[PDB]
Symmetry: C2
Subunit: 348 residues, 2 copies
Amino acid sequence: AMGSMKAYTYVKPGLASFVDVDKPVIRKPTAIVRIVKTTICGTDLHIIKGDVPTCQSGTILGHEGIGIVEEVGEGVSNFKKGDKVLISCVCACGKCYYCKKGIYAHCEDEGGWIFIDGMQAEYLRVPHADNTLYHTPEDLSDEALVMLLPTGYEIGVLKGKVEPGCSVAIIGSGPVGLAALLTAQFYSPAKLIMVDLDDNRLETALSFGATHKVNSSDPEKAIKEIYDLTDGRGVDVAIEAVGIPATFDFCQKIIGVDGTVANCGVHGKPVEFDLDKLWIRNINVTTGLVSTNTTPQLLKALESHKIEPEKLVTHYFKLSEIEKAYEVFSKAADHHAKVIIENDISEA
Amino acid sequence: GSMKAYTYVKPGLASFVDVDKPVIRKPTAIVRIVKTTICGTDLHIIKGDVPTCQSGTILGHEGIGIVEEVGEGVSNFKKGDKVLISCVCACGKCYYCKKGIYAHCEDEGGWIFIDGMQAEYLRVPHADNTLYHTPEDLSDEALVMLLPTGYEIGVLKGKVEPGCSVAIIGSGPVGLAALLTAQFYSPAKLIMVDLDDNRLETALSFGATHKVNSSDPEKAIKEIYDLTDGRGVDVAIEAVGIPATFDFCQKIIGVDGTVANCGVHGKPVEFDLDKLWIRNINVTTGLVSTNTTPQLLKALESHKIEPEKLVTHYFKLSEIEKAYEVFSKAADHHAKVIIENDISEA
Ligand SMILES: [Zn+2]
Ligand SMILES: [Zn+2]
Ligand SMILES: [Zn+2]
Ligand SMILES: [Zn+2]
């Protein structure tokens, strides 16, 4: 039709559909972006399953991407038509109680993690464009820019207080765990211990710069092994990158005196916190939703080629083949699979 | 060569008995107790909750005294010094002492008060790191309270800062200590939460800005959201140590806030990560280290707060069973107690 675009929409628990929808338009004076490349997040799989029921039926999925500005409102000053830009997963009005703190995850004025229609479509309405878009450096690859990584860094690495010479364990060697692994190396920890059940993912973790792998198939033997690597003291940081009670439980068994369990993942159930044992251990437990306030610092730390996040990307698809992209991602272990999805539909 | 001491006998039993006077055992002090007090942990010990505590062990880990003898490796304290004794012993040389985390010292350290302070005399390991000289403008009542548990584990781990909103769950002694020292950082709201209105009136008189009665938890929760613009508190200090108080804290805590747990817990708790993974919160725990005691002594110069009002009743060492009587039924007596050594001679 006319004025329409293609988009991947959530329908109901167990059903998403590549369909025609209206092209978005400017609704407020603070942009419309043409998506160039996007990806899928584990949370998108959860939405389709029905485990994020605040996602209304018909919503366009996805909250990761780069694109090209097509139109801006009267109140947009630092971006114009034609600008190649990165879109953060979090919208920030820049003025409210939480934006003034840099906690864009909890912006109170059409803010936070809302990608409203998301990025698995041809065009995207971006609220608060001046605070949600970033000009992209020409030195970085598209695959690395779509990864902008801030989840692993802000929620796994910074809240965990990784520092040179400390001992880190990362629980869960899927995409968010690997992203935390890459950015934890900005702080040169002595030990980066990847813990997982799958040996293929652990082998990839060593490729990405983990110093040791521990297979959690025998939990007791893994706990022993981690205490053996830390001279009986346990780790200074345990990054929980899976989001189930078992991984949270593992983290609380290996954390040492003064250490931090940094939770990254969504949890769908409450967990049993062993305060009877840990009240005396001087430990911390942190949570958070990414804000992306560090995106400028990560851009700087990537143009220098400290780490190369483009190695998170393993499979390439066209937007019109987004159904296939979901099939590969949801069965990532079968394919040794992050995917990148390129807009093969839109014209300039 | 004997002294009197209050000892843990068996579960449900403690008694005022004659025991050996402690002697120097390591080159690193003997102290004559002047005044001591009772901790809530001493009641848990007598009940049998603290199982590592051997039978016959002298109770108590709080007090001030006069140095009686120092070993030949003690260099900064000498016979006749009037000194505060910290509840935590610190070797000063190990992995954790080098970090200032004295609660986990690896060399006869951490919280061990071995024989305790509810006696005439006390062997003090690592005297140079465990004793502090007493300044001149603080009463004995203020000194025995040295407060570091509320400050290190509640206020500092909770990240109290000027203008922030704080709730303290539990208006018992530790909660009150956290309420006094939180005022060093000038929070805009200090909300005391408890079941007892009398303890909430005392909290008000100690400088709390609001009282909230938690006898109906849901109304209490809604009340605290109304006080904080619907945002919840920046700091929730848990000073009771049961699952229901931890749960109350985790339900009132706001975005970016810290739930600071200082209370000993005996049971695991349900932690609502399904709700709180997205709220950007922190939960802290810890055993007091007393690395802030020097700074607390200095911050008491500003005289912004008066910790000696934590003491409500006075007893002599000889009648210490009477002191325990009053403290274990603290609500019935509107009751911290100060126990003074009437037995020893100077
Ligand atoms: Zn995501
Ligand atoms: Zn905002
Ligand atoms: Zn105590
Ligand atoms: Zn030590």
